[PDB]
Amino acid sequence: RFLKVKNWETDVVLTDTLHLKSTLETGCTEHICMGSIMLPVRTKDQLFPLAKEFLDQYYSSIKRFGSKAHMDRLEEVNKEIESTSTYQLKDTELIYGAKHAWRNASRCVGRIQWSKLQVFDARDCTTAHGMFNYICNHVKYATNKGNLRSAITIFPQRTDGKHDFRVWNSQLIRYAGYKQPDGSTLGDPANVQFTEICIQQGWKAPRGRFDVLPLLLQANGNDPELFQIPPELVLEVPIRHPKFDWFKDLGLKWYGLPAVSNMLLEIGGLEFSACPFSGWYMGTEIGVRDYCDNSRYNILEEVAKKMDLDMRKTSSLWKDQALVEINIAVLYSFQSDKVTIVDHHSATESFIKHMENEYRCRGGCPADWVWIVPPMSGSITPVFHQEMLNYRLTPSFEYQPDPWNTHVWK
């Protein structure tokens, strides 16, 4: 079957065949679309077919499909699975798998960079301290003094589901959130629950507005352990505005390294529950969502007041005006400190080019419109006008339950 997607701004129509290799479900049915829904131990039996699918894809990618190497590898894995119930990926397969999980992430607008991913193999890791060391090396490498480099660190895969490696942080670097008895929130409201877990685990919180959270690391299914990332390794950017000298006085800053660490990387049926990865920020992630979401830093008012906008009626679009300036500030500050960042215009334009390229070289590019379109100025970015097809391909990055909800404490 063939599926056409059209860009209503350019009339460019693309054809998708890649979706044919989509196995996982989407949540939608022929009677209902769940396209805006945030989130709608294996047996030897269902493992080899998953392994075979992957290895076939891998060997096909290196132009060795059907080769003796390919056939031996399949037999090797088959025997290993029957012999040990699981199997180990070769380093090459790991790197290939990691890159493709990114390539397949339909909610990621930065995928034009997928082939350039530095993969750190941390499968020989056995303890939390070991994980800490690996993560520090990842942060230092990825940060590269402001010239950010995409990277992923992969810890040991799941075995029986009772020895999982997990990074309890949702992101390697995030600011603590603190619920005050008066009901107000200090810091990032999104991290209050995790911050409480850290404190409970022994973390001495400086209770500030921008305290870098400590890493809570779980190795081999053991209870997690706290570690403080060396401050000298955490790059941060003070936010100021090019024209508004008072903006800096808002006391705002943000870390330069976005590093998701709570997702599960699935490769050939294998599950890597601890696989922190990082690239670099798109301006709006911070300027629109982290700063202006009502449930996050929510700085729209204070910024609007300082700009002395007419906040008596929404129709003055004061929120919209303040929103722009704030995002101008974020981009300006990062560029000024020479810390990698990309604006939503550049990033979405790049994604369209990436997408078109993917349709031609791969027959498609699963994309989640709801997530791809920036949270501000939607229609003035090309992606808004681009029809997209969302489906799931493996390898992939999947959500997994928060560890504190499933962990058996020792």
Ligand X SMILES: N=C(NCCC[C@H](N)CNCCN)N[N+](=O)[O-]
In the 8-state DSSP scheme, what is residue 229?
P
Q: CB 211: neighbour CB atoms within 10 A?
A: 20
Report the residue number, 226 or 330, with the smaller CB distance to ligand HEM.
330
Minimum Å distance from CB 332 to ligand H4B? 22
How far is residue 110's CA from residue 96's CA, in Å, rounded to a whole number? 18
- Judging by DSSP bridges, how do beta strands 151-154 and 3-6 pair with one another? unpaired
- Is 240 designated active site? no
Rg (CA), the chain: 22
Determine if the peptide bond prior to 395 is cis (ω within 30°): yes
Question: Does residue 38 touch ligand H4B according to CB under 6 A?
Answer: yes
Question: Does residue 397 touch ligand X according to CB under 6 A?
Answer: no
β-bridge mates for residue 43, sequence order: none
Q: Which one of residues 182, 315, 361, 408 is an interface residue with a second copy (CB under 8 A)?
A: 315
- Which of ligand H4B, a second copy, Zn ion, none does 371 bind, CB closer than 5 to 8 A by kind? ligand H4B
Question: Does residue 109 touch ligand HEM according to CB under 6 A?
Answer: yes
Contact set for ligand X, span 146-185 (CB under 6 A): 171
Question: Does residue 397 touch ligand HEM according to CB under 6 A?
Answer: yes
Given the residues 108, 275, 292, 365, the one annotated as active site: 108
- Is 285 designated active site? yes
Q: What spatial distance separates the first Cα and last Cα of the chain, rounded to whole Å?
A: 52
Q: CB 185: neighbour CB atoms within 10 A?
A: 19
Minimum Å distance from CB 152 to ligand X? 9
- Is 280 designated active site? yes
CA torsion sign, 203 to 207 to 208 to 210?
Answer: positive
Q: Using the CB atoms, write b or e for 276-302: b if 16+ within 10 Å.
A: bbbbbbbbbbbbbbbbbeeebbebbee
Q: Which residue is nearest to ligand H4B (CB)?
A: 371
Contact set for ligand HEM, span 246-305 (CB under 6 A): 260, 277-280, 282, 285
371 is in an annotated binding site: yes
Contact 240, 247 (CB under 8 A): yes
297 is in an annotated binding site: no
Minimum Å distance from CB 401 to ligand X? 15
399 is in an annotated binding site: yes
Report the residue number, 216 or 260, with the smaller CB distance to ligand X.
260
Closest residue by Cα to residue 371 from 189, 107, 144, 79: 107
Question: Does residue 171 touch ligand H4B according to CB under 6 A?
Answer: no
Contact set for Zn ion, span 20-59 (CB under 5 A): 28, 33, 35
409 is in an annotated binding site: no
How far is residue 215's CA from residue 217's CA, in Å, rounded to a whole number? 6
Q: Where are the beta strands (DSSP E) in 122-250?
A: 151-154, 166-167, 177-179, 185-187, 215-218, 225-227, 236-238
Given the residues 73, 93, 102, 111, the one annotated as active site: 111
- Is 246 designated active site? no
Contact 103, 111 (CB under 8 A): yes
Element (H, E) at 73: helix 68-84
**Site mask for ligand HEM (CB under 6 A), range 132-161, x = bound:** ------------------x-x---------
280 is in an annotated binding site: yes
How far is residue 265's CA from residue 276's CA, in Å, rounded to a whole number? 9
- Which of a second copy, ligand HEM, ligand H4B, none does 94 bind, CB closer than 5 to 8 A by kind? none
Q: CB 313: neighbour CB atoms within 10 A?
A: 8
Question: Does residue 281 touch ligand X according to CB under 6 A?
Answer: yes
Residues marked as binding? 36, 108, 171, 280-281, 285, 370-371, 384, 399
Q: Given the rule CB under 6 A, which residues bind ligand X? A: 110, 171, 258, 260, 277-282, 285
Q: Given the rule CB under 6 A, which residues bind ligand HEM? A: 102, 105, 107-110, 113, 117, 150, 152, 260, 277-280, 282, 285, 342, 347, 397
Q: Given the rule CB under 8 A, which residues bind a second copy? A: 3, 5-6, 8-9, 19, 22-23, 25-38, 283, 288-289, 292-295, 300, 314-317, 319-321, 323-324, 327-328, 331-332, 335, 343, 345-346, 368-370, 373-380, 384-391
What positions carry a catalytic annotation?
108, 111, 280, 285
